[PDB]
Each structure stands twice: as structure tokens, then as C-alpha cells.
Ligand binder design. Structure first.
Ligand SMILES: *[C@@H]1O[C@H](CO[C@@H]2O[C@@H](C)[C@@H](O)[C@@H](O)[C@@H]2O)[C@@H](O)[C@H](O)[C@H]1NC(C)=O
Ligand SMILES: *[C@@H]1O[C@H](CO[C@@H]2O[C@@H](C)[C@@H](O)[C@@H](O)[C@@H]2O)[C@@H](O)[C@H](O)[C@H]1NC(C)=O
Ligand SMILES: *[C@@H]1O[C@H](CO[C@@H]2O[C@@H](C)[C@@H](O)[C@@H](O)[C@@H]2O)[C@@H](O)[C@H](O)[C@H]1NC(C)=O
Ligand SMILES: *[C@@H]1O[C@H](CO[C@@H]2O[C@@H](C)[C@@H](O)[C@@H](O)[C@@H]2O)[C@@H](O)[C@H](O)[C@H]1NC(C)=O
Ligand SMILES: *[C@@H]1O[C@H](CO[C@@H]2O[C@@H](C)[C@@H](O)[C@@H](O)[C@@H]2O)[C@@H](O)[C@H](O)[C@H]1NC(C)=O
Ligand SMILES: *[C@@H]1O[C@H](CO[C@@H]2O[C@@H](C)[C@@H](O)[C@@H](O)[C@@H]2O)[C@@H](O)[C@H](O)[C@H]1NC(C)=O
Ligand SMILES: *[C@@H]1O[C@H](CO[C@@H]2O[C@@H](C)[C@@H](O)[C@@H](O)[C@@H]2O)[C@@H](O)[C@H](O)[C@H]1NC(C)=O
Ligand SMILES: *[C@@H]1O[C@H](CO[C@@H]2O[C@@H](C)[C@@H](O)[C@@H](O)[C@@H]2O)[C@@H](O)[C@H](O)[C@H]1NC(C)=O
Ligand SMILES: *[C@@H]1O[C@H](CO[C@@H]2O[C@@H](C)[C@@H](O)[C@@H](O)[C@@H]2O)[C@@H](O)[C@H](O)[C@H]1NC(C)=O
Ligand SMILES: *[C@@H]1O[C@H](CO[C@@H]2O[C@@H](C)[C@@H](O)[C@@H](O)[C@@H]2O)[C@@H](O)[C@H](O)[C@H]1NC(C)=O
Ligand SMILES: *[C@@H]1O[C@H](CO[C@@H]2O[C@@H](C)[C@@H](O)[C@@H](O)[C@@H]2O)[C@@H](O)[C@H](O)[C@H]1NC(C)=O
Ligand SMILES: *[C@@H]1O[C@H](CO[C@@H]2O[C@@H](C)[C@@H](O)[C@@H](O)[C@@H]2O)[C@@H](O)[C@H](O)[C@H]1NC(C)=O
Ligand SMILES: *[C@@H]1O[C@H](CO[C@@H]2O[C@@H](C)[C@@H](O)[C@@H](O)[C@@H]2O)[C@@H](O)[C@H](O)[C@H]1NC(C)=O
Ligand SMILES: *[C@@H]1O[C@H](CO[C@@H]2O[C@@H](C)[C@@H](O)[C@@H](O)[C@@H]2O)[C@@H](O)[C@H](O)[C@H]1NC(C)=O
Lengths: 797, 632
């Protein structure tokens, strides 16, 4: 099983009938590599909370009866992969109301025609997949008309030879409906129809159109381009064929001219050539298609790049050149792409990038160069974010203010390319430097000019000898990451106190996997929440302790447990458990006799054992069964009746910003995993079956208390339903702890209409107003967590 | 210190001068993560029986003087790793007579040229290593001529651009000397010399030749393959480059035909492609090389294999295909490998193996398939030994007499695959079955026909309900291993006496971690030396005792130290100390007052150290209910 109570998997166990042992709350069920064959009615009346029900995977089903999936309303998707169904029953998929996708990969369609298909009662049917089938006719059945949510379909590996006009009637029937027609993928078609009254693709807007391998020869694939004329399609991928680019080159230099002749009239926006194995890319390829807003080239082997190659693209935006470089490069790649913005040159084998490379550009706002090249920045436009990982030594950078994001992982940098790069990016926020193997660290000429520096990781790297200078002297909110910096403790003994002096808004410093001997403590910062210290050789105490410190990781370190240092072992004990890390991962090293004991067990004695270990286990057994009772909200299971909630939160819709961020989060954070402090709502947990006013009525009985949030808006339409209820039937008295008033905002007097119950709970004056200052934020949470846990007043007098 | 008197290790202690506290008999000294810098004469006149003296590891040695290692004749190896020496003194390594290997990993050679090197007085110098250096010239100094014991050297991460003929003169001087030239590994070379009177590798037999990453482009690397022509090399690894196989494919389809052109003349015997990241394996790769006596493909990612893929290999023997499977498989992989014998398909991800897989084979004598596939034996030739572990349910086996060794660990077997597989292996000797989780145990249809059965371990498994039948009725010298078999004590009561009946030449039976209630004793075997009995719930004595029993393990068991069973507690005593196990690990369980006391301390009476703790625990359990309800 993957997850307890929810996710259960059964990967090949050879069962005959379904598994009943599973619970009814199982949301993700997986039955594959098994056999059931005959699927009779009432198959799964057990589970009713399913979503991911991957049934069909080589389950070799022979037939399918009706009422198979009747008790599966919340059924999201169903994957009938590699199945062999012969008989298809009309009312088999009945009851599936929330069915979106449906994978019918190799369902064994011996009954090719889709007319007999039964996907009419599937309105939420979005992505209906049909691959590895034997469909002969592309003729869309009238049932597609009802399919409004139908967004994508993948017709691949079927058959379909001719594509008449009459086979596209339901298409023109819908005025607004996206359609990712992924047909003609790995087929054996021959010809199609053209002309007629209206072209088969005339007055028809499609989302996506794939033609991954259509014909056998270039001569028969030209007629098809004459039928796709006058068609408004977003994308159009011509993959698995084009081995070379050019004026209009595909295979043979003679019939390759009639191809672009039909796509010239149509205004193509997106053109992709993935897995096309384009060796050479001749001069001027996309010239007829200037309306190409976005292009795509994934997994290729480009080598011929002319200065007139990308010409024609007057308005390009996106362009992913993923794995298609290597084999030298020239100067000025994109000379005709001023409006370019996003480019993805991930995973390549470029040697050395020249100076003038990213010439004639301006609107470039995102440069992703993962494992691209040796990187040489000189004429790189205003790009806010850039990714440069998996590289080597980098040369002088050249960027501007616009750069607010930048990444550098798994590299080999120096103290030059980092200084100048930061000199003009005060808008920088996130920055990463993991496993860069820093060579030399300057005194203060590397991380200069960067006030808004938020994230800054310096893990796995080396410095000039050891840390002995302050680099972060201008970084206020600098969250550093010092993981194994190979720092020699000899120079760390006289560590400059002016390093952790400027840092005032530090969230947490992580000094782990390091190699120090004396753990200095400069508690100048006051916003430090954590300090990870593990895999070290520390053994030195310090009276100076931070104020906001809470979680101090100090596990697995060379601790000397003898009579020499008794002041250090004394500090860690005085710091209570509230200020310490897992005691379980702390053992003494130096001691040969005693090895594997936590510091919170060693005896502080100055330099009969069976009695010692027998008395201490008794003293342990004297307190551990005396403090768990005392130490360990109001238990719902001990309540007289059966209440489901602790407090019903009554509020307004305009004041959701507070009830959703502060109130709920501060009352749910405690005993969250224990699910003890539950809150009743009116929109999160309701009954459609029920009435508005009464929805609150039931919430009163179920909840232990009622904590409303009176406001200048809560009176406008939140009290209009409450006051009316108090008139007829009474429930909440005056001086009872059952009701708790909370004033989030001062409410005037003119707002109060003729309601007599609103001014009744204000007369008693027992509300909990929201403090204005931030220092008072806590005294409110105290009482807000008290009055509710308070025992309700009894009925007797 | 690792071992008393001999092995002492000082891992990061920060000490200027060497540790004088060590003894003279210290054979293994480890001084790393420290600092000494100036190494003056008479460094270690204390220790004189050293062998493993790893000195240099980031010890940042600035300079080195003479007479440093004078008092270290028995000094075997020295590893100066990650060091930074500037000045090299000629007579620095004097006195080393038994110095074999020498690791100079990143010694910081600011004085690149090796002419200034001083390794003449080192005759025992076998494996001289020089990695991560800055050597520019491959020119071998005349000093190599004296190095007769010089077997291997690793020239990696240096510089070396051109490899002339004149840089390979000391080689031709020696008529008999193995040399594992591991040069050109991660360099930045460009070209070499060709033609001339004689080729640079003409009339020169080498043991090993590594070229892990040489050029930058396929074009410049083709010149190198034309200079290595006519060379008698035992091995030749082309690693970290070939991302695809084929008729002679490497990178670009045009300049990859001139590669095999030069290696065609030279008769290659060993060809390895480790860490090559070979994805696709086209048809017919090694065709020009038919003299390849042995092959090797370690750490690769082979998706699919063609039928004519392994074509060309006429006389193959060894073939370690370690971690390079997954991605479906076809029928008849090695159709052209009759003479193949040893193959290593360790660590792979194969779903199911077809019927006809090991077709056209015969001289296969050792099949190692550690964590290979679901294993489906059908057309397997005469293979004496085979290793099948880290697998799942195994189907009907098909082997012959030739199989004398077989292993099965960490699996899920039944009573079918073990029966038939044993029906034709009377020559079997060793057999392991640790953690196989046996499903159903047959009465006598599983361990049949196997007289020469020597080792037979049945640790961690299950049987039909419990042990209640004699399986080893034909196994004479069968050394069983019964560790935790989940045997229910209810059926163990009527344990068939005919189980330990046939077993006469038994060395020792291990009945540990089990869960029996009564310990029976059928002393029929007269050769049983030992009988491990621990982690059980036994409490039954028996007059029948073996004769050759010496060590009887009987610790950590549910023993009832009361007045009920007095005959059992009286037996373990008469059996003397010579026939017993560690009394220290024997404590009473059932009792609550008398707890934690060895059977050889209990008194036999009819119905004082561990007594005071039983009284102080009561007094503190009485004085507590008193002062708790009062305090807080
Ligand atoms: C999973 O299925 C196992 C196999 O069930 C059947 O076993 C015999 C009787 C044959 O008829 C075979 O075709 C069947 O597959 C069960 O033993 C097992 O109990 C099942 N798991 C559950 C739900 O307990
Ligand atoms: C699993 O769920 C089964 C069906 O539960 C309910 O049955 C009736 C009472 C209706 O209220 C219906 O809406 C529900 O589906 C139970 O019969 C069964 O006891 C459950 N399994 C467990 C946990 O016992
Ligand atoms: C492309 O279409 C061309 C014209 O097809 C038909 O030719 C005659 C039979 C007319 O009467 C009418 O049916 C059409 O105009 C073909 O000559 C050519 O072969 C086609 N290309 C292919 C698919 O091979
Ligand atoms: C850039 O292109 C990326 C890859 O696109 C495709 O992803 C799948 C469907 C493959 O099977 C293959 O055909 C392509 O590689 C996208 O993930 C990314 O969204 C694209 N950039 C944009 C516009 O966001
Ligand atoms: C980076 O910015 C340089 C300076 O641009 C501006 O100069 C004057 C006009 C002021 O308005 C000032 O605030 C600006 O900083 C440009 O000269 C330079 O071309 C830019 N770098 C690039 C992308 O070439
Ligand atoms: C150790 O902890 C002592 C108690 O701290 C807290 O005291 C009140 C406010 C309670 O809410 C309680 O639960 C807490 O444990 C401190 O008085 C003492 O200063 C601490 N030791 C140190 C590090 O000085
Ligand atoms: C745990 O620490 C105990 C108390 O620590 C401190 O002792 C003195 C020096 C006081 O002035 C005050 O700071 C604290 O109360 C020790 O009594 C005890 O032995 C320690 N436990 C262990 C691990 O032995
Ligand atoms: C190990 O070395 C310890 C100290 O050695 C050095 O002492 C001075 C000269 C400083 O430069 C210091 O940084 C060095 O670490 C000794 O105290 C110790 O006794 C030595 N270990 C032994 C052999 O007992
Ligand atoms: C270690 O050995 C030192 C030298 O002892 C001997 O000196 C002359 C006589 C030679 O025969 C030489 O081979 C011998 O090693 C001693 O000074 C020293 O005490 C010894 N260390 C110990 C074990 O105390
Ligand atoms: C490989 O060698 C090519 C030409 O080989 C010879 O070069 C000199 C010695 C001439 O005088 C003549 O003997 C030959 O033509 C170069 O064209 C080629 O660039 C070299 N490979 C590299 C490093 O690119
Ligand atoms: C079979 O191959 C085994 C391991 O292969 C590799 O050995 C060396 C070169 C290392 O690079 C290692 O990482 C590899 O796994 C050998 O142990 C074995 O000797 C080879 N078979 C032979 C011929 O004996
Ligand atoms: C296993 O052995 C079978 C029998 O081989 C022999 O048959 C006659 C000729 C006698 O000489 C007898 O002693 C031998 O046992 C073969 O038929 C069979 O092919 C072998 N199994 C394999 C590897 O296919
Ligand atoms: C150890 O055992 C000694 C011998 O016990 C029995 O002596 C007679 C009565 C025979 O019947 C024979 O079966 C046994 O050997 C005791 O005398 C001695 O008390 C024992 N030691 C202890 C634990 O007290
Ligand atoms: C117990 O051992 C008795 C004699 O003890 C042995 O005495 C001498 C001769 C040495 O061999 C010494 O090692 C022995 O401990 C036997 O008389 C007696 O039969 C043994 N008890 C049993 C198990 O029957």
C-alpha cells in the first residue's frame, strides 16, 4: 500500500475476483497484471470514493456487462490499457458523472467503427484517448455534439485511409469548442478530398493538430496539404519525417514545393518539429509563415544554421531548442527576432559560445540555459530570470537591473563573474549556488550591491584557506547556506565577529557537515529562528544565546564525554528540551568504554553498576508514568452527547481575508493531525438537501460552542438570519459561555437596525475585541482558545 | 587505534610533529588531515616496521628534504594524496627498498617534467601512480629502464598534447615488461605523429591501455587511431564517449569510418566500454575485431539489442554486462557465441525472460545472474555454477549433471522449481536458501536425488503448516540450517523421528530463532559436533544425549525456574560446563520475584544480590503512593 487509508495498490498478485479487504474510503485503487475476464453487473459496490481507478492494464477482459460502474459517481479517470474486449454493451459506462479522461490504449477494437460507441452520458468527458486501435473511419458520430467539455483526443495507430468532408459535420455544429485532433499519427493513409462546396477544414478552429508520420512517400503527402487549406489552427506539428529544412524542402526537391503552397493561405500560429531528426537547417525556412507566434523544436540534431535561417519569423515569442545543438556555431543566431522572449536550450553539447551571439534582441525576458554551454554573456538583453547550471568556468558577465532572478548549480566559478554580475541586480531575490566548488573568496568583492538579496545558498564549495572575512556586509535579509565549506578551524578560532553582524533578518543559518572545533555564539541577530549544526567536531560552550531561537539542531558530533568539559554538557541540559534537536542522534565518540549514549544521560561525576541501572530505571519508571497523565482541548469522546465539532465559526463573506488567514489557521494549527480542534462552517460543510437558515441550525447542535465574528458587514447579511431564529426558538441565552462574541472591527450605531437581539449580546459586554497593536497578538489567542475550551454552564440553578 | 599493537590511526588530530607515543611494531600508521609542511631529515626514526604509511593526504607539505624515509626498509606503499610540494630533492626517497606502489594523486606538480623525477633507486616500484598532475611531456625518462617490476602506471588529468615517437624509446629497450599505460585520460590533446621509420607503438607489447576521454571532437580523435596502428595490446578501453554503437558509429556519420580503419590491422584481444552511456546498440558492432578473446560492458544503458548485434565475435570468453539491461528484450541474444563461458549480468531491471534466450551456446561454465530477471531456464547449456538471487517466483528449471554449484538468496520459491532442479545434480555441493520464504513443503518431493549434498541452508522460510515430514531421507552429509521457520509448537509435539534418522555425517544443526515448546532429542547421529539452540520457548528434558556433542548453545529461552520442572534444570547441570553454552545469556522469564538469574544459580527446593533490588523496589513502590497524592 502507498498511503494509509486512501492509496492502495495491487501490482501483479494474480487474483480472480476484486479485493474486498480494501476500505470504502480508498481513493486510488490499482488492479493490473491480473485477470477477471467476465465483468458482471455490480462489480465494485464496495468502494465509492474512487478517482484513480486504473482498471484494464493487461487484465485481459473478454466481455463487459451493464451496471459495471454504477456505484462510482466520483470516478475521475479510468485506464483500460492493453485490453481485449470483444462485446461492447451500450449501457456499460452508466453512472459515471465525473468522468473526465479515459485511456483506451489497445482496448482490442475488433469492432472498429465508433458509431456503436457509448460516450453520450459523459458530459465531463474532456480527454478521450483512443490509441493502438483499428478505427477505419474518422467519421465523427453525432454524439460528439453533446461533448462540450471534450478538449482533447489522441487518434493514433488506427487505420483511416480517406478523410471526406461528411466525416467532419459535428465539428461545424459547435461554435465554441477546443479540439486537439491528434489523428493521422502512425497511420497508412493514401489520399483525401478537396474542393467541394466547403473544405473539410473550412470554418473550423482546432486547438491542436498532430500529423506524426502520415504517408509513405512525399508525393502522396502533398495532396493532404491541399485539403488542410483555409483552416484556423493554433498548433501544427509536422514530426517524424522532415530530415532537412529549407525554402520548402522535405524529401524530393520536386514535389516538396506543393507542400508550403497550401499552408501559405492558412495562418499558422504554432509549428513544432519534434523527433524529426533535422540534420541540416538550410537558409530561410519559415518565410511563408510570418504569423507564427510560437515555435518548437525538441530532440533534434541541427548543424547548419544560416544567417537567414530564422528569417520570416517577424513576431516570435516562445521557442524551445531542447537538445539540438553541438557541431560549432556562428555569430548572431536570432537576427530577426526582436519580440522573442522565452527560449529553452536545455541539454546540449556546445563548445564555446562566441561574443556576438544573442544579437538583435530586446524583449527577451526568460533565458533557460540548463547544461547549455560554457556561457559567455556580453550582448544579453533585459532578461529578469536566467538559469545557468551544469557548466564550467564563466567569463565576465554583462547584465542590467532587470535581472531579479538567477541560478547557478553544479558549476565551477571564481570571484570575478559573481561580483560584476551582482553590481547591477539589487532587484535580485532568489539565488542558488550548490556544488560550485568556489576557488578563491575575496574579502568584500563578491557579494556586493544586493540589498533585496533573499535566498543565497553556498553549499559545497571552497574558500581562500578558510573563512576569515565578512562578505555579507550590505545584505540585510541574507539567508546564507553554509554546508561543508571545508573551513579549517584554525582560522575559525579567530572568526571575524563582523560577518554575522549586518545580518539582522536571518531566518536560519545552517552550519552542517562542516569541520569546526569551537562553536562561537554571536547572538547579535534577533530574528534567527533556527540554526542547523550536525556532522561537526564542536565542543565549546558560550553564555550568549539568541532570543528567537527555538530549534537548535545539534546531533551527531564529536562530543567529548569526560570530566574535562563539564560546562558544555551543562549548557545543553539547561537549554531544556524546547531548545534542542533529536537526542536520539547524539552519542559520545572519544569514550572507549561508553559508546552510544545521549548527552542527556551521562553522569557529571569528577575524575555496583547493576544497582545503578536498576534504580535509575525505577526513577524513570516513577516519573514516565506520572507525567504523561499530567502533561497530556476538550475531548469530544468524553462529551455527554455526540458532537462532531468544537466551535462553529459564523462570519461574513466580505471578511473572508481574516477568517481564512488568521482565525482558521490559528485554531487549526493546534491538534491539526490529532483533528481535535475542529471548526464548523456554512460553505465548507453544508447540505445541498437542506435550507439556508437551517444549515446554521444544525451547525449549532453539532458544534460545542458558537464563535461568531461581529463586524460592520456581519450585521448587513450575517445577522439577518440569526436574529430571526432567536425570535421563534430560543437556544443561546445572555450570560452563557455557549455563545462567544468577537469584534474584528468597531461597529457603529447607525448600522444597527431594529434588531433587538444584536444589542442584547453587546449589553453584557463579554466580547473579545481584536487588538490593534502587534504586541497584543497572543493575549487574544489565549482567551480565544480558553472560552471555547471552557466548560459550558449547566442548566440547574 | 583500530588494532592493539600494530594498527594505529590518527584521523584528523592536528599535530605539528609526528606522534612519538606510537610503538616500534606499528605496521599501519595513518596521518591524514594534519599539517607538517617542512619535512626535515630523520622524520620517522621511531617506527621501522611500517608497511601502510599513508602520508600526504592534505598534509600540505611545502618542501621535502633528504633522508626523510631512511629508516623504513619494510615500507610497502606511500600515498601522498592532495599534497602541494614545490621543491623536489633528488635523494629524498632514499632507503626505500621494499617500496611497491606509490600514489601521487594531486601532488601539485609545479615542476611538470618528469626528468627531474627520482624513482631510480626504487626497483620494487610496481604500480607508480601519477594522477591529477600537470605533466606536459609523455617523454619517458631513461630511469624506466631500471624499473623492471614496473607493472602499471596511471597518467590521468595532466596535460600532454603531442605524443611523438621519441617519447617512447625506453619501451622498446625492454623485451619483457608488462605496462598498463593509462594515459590520455581526461586530457586536452590535439594530435600525434604518424608514419616515420617506425610507428610510436610499433613492436611494443602493452598490458593495459586506457583512453578515458581524449579529444574534444570526433575529427581530431581520428588522427590518434591512425597512430596506434600495429600495436600488440592485451586490452583497450574506449570509455566516456561512445553514446551509440554500430558498423563503426561514434558521433558524426562521416568521420567515424576512419576509426576502425586503424584498429582493423591491430589484433585487439580485450575491448571494454565502461561508463560509455551507450543507449542504442545497432546491428554488427565488433565485426573487424574477431580476435577479441574477452569483452566487457560495465555501467551502460542499453535499450534494445539487434539480432546481428553481437555478430563478429568468433572466440569470446568473458563478458561482464553489469547494469545495462531493461527496456524489453528479444529472442536469441548470443547466437554467435559458442565459445562463450563467463558472463556477468549483475544488477538489472528485466521483467520477464523469453524461452529462447541463451540460444546457440555450449562452453558456458559460469552464469552469474545476481538480481538479473524473473529467471526462466529452458535452453541452458552445461553450466556447473550459477547464482540466482534478488529475484522472484521461478518457473520450471532445466539443467543437467554438470551443475555442481547453485545459489538462491532473497527470493520467493515453491516446491516445483527446487524438486526438478535437484533431480539431475548429484554432483551438487554448495546450496544456499537464505530468506526465500518457502510456500508449501512437500513430504519427499523437493530435496530428492542429491547424495553429495554438502551445504544446505534453509534459513527464513515457511512450510505447509509446520514441520511434520522427512524431506532429507536420501541426504547423507546434509548440513541443514533451520533458523526461524515459523514452526507451530502444536505439530512439533509429534515430530517425525525419521527426519534426523538418515543424517549420519552431520556437522551441526542450527535450531535458533524458532518457536518450539518441547525440545526432543534423537541422538541417532553420531557425528553431530554442535547444536545451536537459542531464542526459543523450550522447557523439556530428555535422557538421550549425543556422543560427539561438545558445544551446546542454550541461551535466551523461556525457561520456567519453579518447582514444577525440576528434572530439566537438573539435567543441564550434570552435563558439566564442557557441554553447555554461555551462562551469562540465560535468565528466568516466567518468575516475577526471582528474575534475571542464570540456571546455574537457582536453588532446588520444593514448593541475595538480586534480592535487595527486589526489596528496595517494593519499599519505593510503597513510599511513593504515600508522597505523591500529597505533593503535586
Ligand atoms: C488474491 O488472489 C489469490 C489467488 O486466488 C485464486 O486462487 C486459486 C483458488 C485459483 O482459482 C486462482 O485462479 C485464483 O487467482 C488468493 O489466494 C488471495 O486470497 C487474493 N487476495 C486476497 C483478497 O486475500
Ligand atoms: C463499506 O460501505 C458499505 C456501504 O455503505 C452504506 O450503505 C448504506 C447504509 C447507505 O447509507 C449507503 O449510502 C452507503 O454506501 C457498508 O455496507 C459497509 O459496512 C462498509 N464497510 C465497512 C467499513 O464496514
Ligand atoms: C493528387 O490528386 C491528383 C488529382 O486526383 C484526381 O485525378 C482525376 C482522377 C480526377 O478526375 C479527380 O478525381 C482528381 O483531380 C492525382 O493526379 C495525384 O495522384 C494525387 N496525389 C497522390 C495522392 O498520389
Ligand atoms: C517547451 O517545450 C516543452 C516540451 O514540449 C513537448 O513535451 C511533450 C508533450 C513531448 O512528448 C514533446 O513532444 C515536446 O518536447 C514544454 O514542456 C514547454 O511547455 C514548452 N515551453 C512553453 C511554451 O511553456
Ligand atoms: C544597461 O543600462 C545602461 C544604462 O541605462 C540607463 O542610462 C541612463 C539613460 C539612465 O536612465 C539610467 O538610470 C539607466 O541605467 C545602458 O547604457 C546599457 O545599454 C544596458 N546594458 C545593456 C543591456 O546593453
Ligand atoms: C528552561 O525552561 C524554563 C521554563 O520555561 C517555560 O516557563 C513557562 C513560561 C511555561 O509556559 C513552561 O511550559 C516553559 O517550560 C525557563 O524558566 C528556563 O529559563 C529555561 N532554561 C534556560 C535555557 O534558561
Ligand atoms: C541536567 O542538569 C541538571 C541541572 O542543571 C543546572 O545545574 C546548576 C549548575 C543550576 O545552577 C542550574 O543552572 C541548573 O539546574 C543537573 O542537576 C543534572 O545532573 C543533569 N542531568 C544529567 C544528564 O546528569
Ligand atoms: C597532537 O597535537 C597537539 C597540539 O599540536 C600543536 O601544538 C601547537 C604547536 C599549535 O600549533 C597547535 O595548533 C597544534 O595542534 C598536542 O597538544 C597533543 O598532545 C598531540 N597528541 C598527542 C600525540 O598526544
Ligand atoms: C624503537 O627502536 C629504537 C632503536 O632500537 C635499536 O637501535 C639499534 C641498536 C638498531 O639495532 C635498531 O635497528 C634498533 O631499532 C629504540 O631507541 C626505541 O626504544 C624503540 N622503541 C620502543 C619500543 O621503546
Ligand atoms: C589529422 O591530419 C590531417 C592531415 O594529415 C597530415 O598532416 C600533415 C602531417 C601533412 O603534411 C600530411 O602528411 C597529411 O595530410 C589534418 O588536416 C587534420 O586537421 C588532423 N586532425 C585534426 C587535429 O584536426
Ligand atoms: C568482470 O567485471 C568485474 C567488474 O567490472 C569492473 O571492474 C573494474 C574495471 C571497475 O571499474 C569496476 O567498477 C567494474 O565493475 C570484475 O570484478 C571481474 O574481474 C570481471 N571478470 C573477470 C574477467 O574476471
Ligand atoms: C541433459 O542430458 C540429456 C541426456 O544426455 C545423455 O544421454 C545419453 C547419450 C547418455 O550418455 C546419458 O548418460 C546422458 O545423460 C541430453 O539429451 C540433454 O540435451 C541435456 N540437457 C540439455 C542441456 O539440453
Ligand atoms: C548441580 O547438580 C548437582 C547434581 O545433581 C544431581 O545429583 C543426584 C541427586 C543425581 O540424581 C543426578 O541426576 C544429578 O547430577 C547438585 O547436587 C547441585 O546442587 C547443583 N548445583 C546447584 C545449581 O545447586
Ligand atoms: C561430566 O563429566 C564427568 C567427568 O569430568 C571430566 O573429568 C576429567 C577426567 C576431565 O576430562 C574434565 O575435563 C572433565 O570435566 C563424567 O564422569 C560425566 O559422565 C559427565 N556427565 C555427563 C554429561 O554424563
Amino acid at each position: 500500500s502507498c498511503s494509509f487509508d486512501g492509496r492502495i495498490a495491487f501490482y501483479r498478485f494474480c487474483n480472480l475476483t476484486q479485493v474486498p479487504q480494501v476500505l470504502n474510503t480508498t481513493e486510488r485503487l490499482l488492479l493490473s497484471f491480473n485477470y477477471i475476464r467476465t465483468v458482471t453487473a455490480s462489480s465494485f459496490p464496495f468502494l465509492e470514493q474512487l478517482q484513480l481507478l486504473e482498471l484494464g492494464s493487461q487484465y485481459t477482459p473478454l466481455t463487459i456487462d451493464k451496471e459495471a460502474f454504477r456505484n462510482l459517481p466520483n470516478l475521475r479517470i479510468l485506464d483500460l490499457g492493453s485490453s481485449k474486449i470483444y462485446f461492447l454493451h451500450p449501457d456499460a459506462f452508466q453512472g459515471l458523472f465525473h468522468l473526465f479522461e479515459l485511456r483506451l490504449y489497445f482496448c482490442g477494437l475488433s469492432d472498429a467503427v465508433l458509431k456503436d460507441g457509448y460516450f453520450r452520458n459523459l458530459k465531463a468527458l474532456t480527454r478521450l484517448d483512443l490509441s493502438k486501435n483499428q478505427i477505419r473511419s474518422l467519421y465523427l458520430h453525432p454524439s460528439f455534439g453533446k461533448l462540450n467539455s471534450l478538449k482533447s483526443i489522441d487518434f493514433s495507430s488506427n487505420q483511416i485511409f480517406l478523410v471526406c468532408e461528411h466525416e467532419l459535420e459535428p465539428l461545424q455544429g459547435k461554435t465554441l469548442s477546443f479540439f486537439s485532433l491528434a489523428a493521422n499519427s502512425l497511420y497508412s493513409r493514401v489520399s483525401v478530398d478537396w474542393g467541394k462546396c466547403m473544405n473539410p477544414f473550412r470554418n473550423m478552429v482546432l486547438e491542436i493538430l498532430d500529423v506524426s508520420g502520415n504517408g509513405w512517400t512525399v508525393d502522396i503527402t502533398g495532396n493532404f496539404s491541399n485539403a488542410i487549406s483555409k483552416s484556423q489552427a493554433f498548433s501544427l506539428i509536422l514530426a517524424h519525417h522532415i530530415m532537412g529544412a529549407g525554402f520548402g524542402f522535405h524529401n524530393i526537391k520536386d514535389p516538396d514545393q506543393n507542400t508550403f503552397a497550401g499552408l501559405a493561405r492558412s495562418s499558422v500560429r504554432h509549428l513544432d518539429l519534434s523527433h524529426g531528426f533535422v540534420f541540416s537547417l538550410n537558409s530561410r525556412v519559415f518565410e511563408t509563415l510570418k504569423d507564427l507566434k510560437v515555435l518548437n523544436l525538441a530532440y533534434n540534431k541541427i548543424n547548419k544554421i544560416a544567417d537567414e535561417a530564422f528569417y520570416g519569423l517577424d513576431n516570435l515569442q516562445v521557442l524551445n531548442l531542447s537538445y539540438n545543438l553541438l557541431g560549432e556555431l556562428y555569430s548572431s543566431n536570432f537576427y530577426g527576432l526582436p519580440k522573442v522572449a522565452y527560449i529553452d536550450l536545455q541539454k546540449n553539447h556546445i563548445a564555446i559560445i562566441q561574443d556576438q551571439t544573442f544579437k538583435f534582441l530586446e524583449k527577451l525576458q526568460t533565458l533557460d540555459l540548463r547544461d547549455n554551454a560554457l556561457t559567455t554573456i556580453h550582448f544579453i538583453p533585459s532578461i529578469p530570470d536566467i538559469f545557468l547550471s551544469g557548466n564550467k568556468l564563466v567569463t565576465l558577465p554583462k547584465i542590467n537591473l532587470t535581472a531579479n532572478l538567477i541560478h547557478l548549480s553544479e558549476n565551477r566559478l571564481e570571484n570575478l563573474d559573481i561580483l560584476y554580475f551582482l553590481l547591477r541586480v539589487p532587484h535580485l531575490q532568489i539565488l542558488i549556488l550548490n556544488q560550485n566548488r568556489f576557488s578563491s573568496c575575496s574579502g568584500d568583492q563578491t557579494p556586493s550591491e544586493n540589498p533585496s538579496l533573499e535566498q543565497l545558498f553556498l553549499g559545497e564549495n571552497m574558500l581562500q584557506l578558510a573563512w576569515e572575512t565578512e562578505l555579507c556586509w550590505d545584505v540585510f535579509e541574507g539567508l546564507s547556506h553554509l554546508q561543508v565549506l571545508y573551513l579549517n578551524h584554525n582560522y575559525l578560532n579567530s572568526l571575524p565577529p563582523g560577518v554575522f553582524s549586518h545580518l539582522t533578518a536571518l531566518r536560519g543559518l545552517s552550519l552542517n557537515s562542516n569541520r569546526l572545533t569551537v562553536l562561537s555564539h554571536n547572538d547579535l541577530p534577533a530574528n534567527l529562528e533556527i540554526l542547523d549544526i550536525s556532522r561537526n567536531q564542536l565542543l565549546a560552550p558560550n553564555p550568549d544565546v539568541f532570543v528567537s531561537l527555538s530549534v537548535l539542531d545539534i546531533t551527531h558530533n564529536k562530543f567529548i564525554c569526560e570530566c574535562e568539559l563539564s560546562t558544555f554538557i551543562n549548557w545543553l541540559n539547561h537549554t531544556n528540551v524546547t531548545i534542542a534537536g533529536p537526542p536520539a542522534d547524539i552519542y559520545c565518540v572519544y569514550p572507549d568504554s561508553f559508546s552510544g549514549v545521549s548527552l542527556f544521560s551521562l553522569s557529571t561525576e569528577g575524575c555496583f553498576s547493576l544497582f545503578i541501572v536498576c534504580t535509575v530505571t525505577l526513577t524513570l519508571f516513577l516519573m514516565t508514568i506520572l507525567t504523561v497523565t499530567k502533561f497530556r482541548d476538550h475531548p469530544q469522546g468524553t462529551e455527554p452527547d455526540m458532537y462532531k465539532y468544537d466551535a462553529y465559526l459564523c462570519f461574513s463573506s466580505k471578511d473572508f481575508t481574516w477568517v481564512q488567514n488568521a482565525l482558521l489557521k490559528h485554531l487549526d494549527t493546534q491538534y491539526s493531525d490529532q483533528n481535535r480542534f475542529n471548526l464548523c462552517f456554512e460553505e465548507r460543510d453544508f447540505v445541498p438537501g437542506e435550507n439556508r437558515i437551517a444549515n446554521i441550525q444544525d451547525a449549532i447542535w453539532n458544534s460545542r460552542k458558537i464563535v461568531c465574528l461581529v463586524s460592520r458587514h456581519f450585521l448587513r447579511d450575517g445577522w439577518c438570519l440569526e436574529a430571526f431564529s432567536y425570535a421563534q426558538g430560543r437556544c443561546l441565552s445572555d450570560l452563557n459561555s455557549a455563545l462567544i462574541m468577537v469584534v474584528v472591527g468597531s461597529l457603529s450605531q447607525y448600522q444597527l437596525m431594529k434588531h433587538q437581539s444584536i444589542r442584547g449580546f453587546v449589553q453584557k459586554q463579554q466580547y473579545l475585541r481584536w487588538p490593534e497593536d502587534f504586541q497584543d497578538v497572543g493575549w487574544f489567542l489565549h482567551k480565544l482558545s480558553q472560552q471555547i475550551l471552557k466548560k459550558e454552564k449547566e442548566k440547574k440553578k
